[PDB]
Symmetry: C2
Amino acid sequence: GMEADARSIYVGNVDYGATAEELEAHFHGCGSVNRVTILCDKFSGHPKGFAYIEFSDKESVRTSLALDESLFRGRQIKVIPKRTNRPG
Amino acid sequence: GMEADARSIYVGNVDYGATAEELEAHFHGCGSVNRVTILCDKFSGHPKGFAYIEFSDKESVRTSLALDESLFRGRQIKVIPKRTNRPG
């Protein structure tokens, strides 16, 4: 829901070989993670997918923003709050 | 939405090392896959997570039911229609 979403980030430029363990490991230093959701629309060739990371605390979202443009599995990831293009 | 959900299955007993490519490969014979969603609540130790597979055609859901109790990454998976515990 909206409260879980307020504690979540969108992570762009994720590939079809990414695992939840790898993603949690990348964001571990930002704080405790409740849930990792990976959404893939391509399963071979050029990838097409993203993830949501739901943190336990809201302050971890702000912290995680420093990981925008960081290298994850050899690709620069995009990190924004999950509710960015949503009212509030 | 409800129409995407009607073309989707829930897959239980998925672990934090599962990839979308592996999951699509397991269900490939059932028909074309639109999207794989992996949802993990544990990232080490005993796993806790599941997935949704959204097929291109609704008939692929029925076909995929034969994969209930099949071995995926060394574990017996649970396959049910995504809207099972939902009205319709």
